[PDB]
Amino acid sequence: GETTDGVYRVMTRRLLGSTQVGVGVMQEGVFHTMWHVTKGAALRSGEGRLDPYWGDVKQDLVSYCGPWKLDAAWDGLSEVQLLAVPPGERAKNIQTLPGIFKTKDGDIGAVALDYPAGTSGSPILDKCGRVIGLYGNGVVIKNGSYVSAITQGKRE
Amino acid sequence: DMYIERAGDITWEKDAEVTGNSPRLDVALDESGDFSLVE
Numbered sequence: 001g002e003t004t005d006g007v008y009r010v011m012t013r014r015l016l017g018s019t020q021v022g023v024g025v026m027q028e029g030v031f032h033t034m035w036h037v038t039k040g041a042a043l044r045s046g047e048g049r050l051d052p053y054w055g056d057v058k059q060d061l062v063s064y065c066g067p068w069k070l071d072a073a074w075d076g077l078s079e080v081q082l083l084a085v086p087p088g089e090r091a092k093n094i095q096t097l098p099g100i101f102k103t104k105d106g107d108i109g110a111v112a113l114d115y116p117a118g119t120s121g122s123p124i125l126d127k128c129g130r131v132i133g134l135y136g137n138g139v140v141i142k143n144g145s146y147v148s149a150i151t152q153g154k155r156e
Numbered sequence: 157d158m159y160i161e162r163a164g165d166i167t168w169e170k171d172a173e174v175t176g177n178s179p180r181l182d183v184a185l186d187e188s189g190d191f192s193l194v195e
């Protein structure tokens with residue numbers, strides 16, 4: 001299968017035609033996505049198979065072929081880029097300054113950009129192109145607009 | 157059955173469309189991984 005670093009679409013043929021169920025990151029031979037995109041199902045890359053390796057429904061993350069590899073963090077100050085990959089549209093960088101999710105267990109960076117559900121797993125990055133975490137698990141605000149968390153995992 | 161298709165390289169791109177506000181929200185995270193607004 002294709003194991004070149006980059007951003008990938010996550011597709012199904014189980015519904016009408018081919019449907020983008022979301023996105024993920026291929027890094028060091030590991031595929032990284034949000035748990036709500038695949039629900040822990042195996043994935044096809046050509047005639048190669050990607051087995052789940054690590055997942056956590058609460059963090060809403062899953063890794064394929066290996067442990068989570070993405071360890072960069074938002075610096076709490078600088079603007080970031082959503083590399084948005086929307087269903088049937090060309091990958092696009094969108095620059096924003098993260099908001100903050102205040103929780104009992106502390107502060108998470110957050111992004112206020114709305115894309116379709118099938119944009120879920122689009123990688124947020126820093127000025128050196130490091131993946132600081134993924135788009136697609138967040139909140140609907142008083143407006144009705146979408147605010148997404150910078151969901152990052154742990155590297156061991 | 158799910159399959160992946162490459163969509164691009166991962167890279168910072170100078171003069172991306174610059175947009176979105178930066179709200180400070182009080183949130184709760186449930187055991188099912190659903191964020192919710194505290195008020």
Ligand SMILES: Cc1cn2ccc(C(=O)Nc3ccncc3C)cc2n1
Pocket residue numbers: 036060114115116117118119120135136137138146188189190191
């Ligand atoms: C824990 C869990 C289950 N989830 C199921 C779906 C989504 C989702 O697609 N949300 C959006 C709605 C509107 N605009 C953009 C997005 C990203 C998120 C999610 N999180």
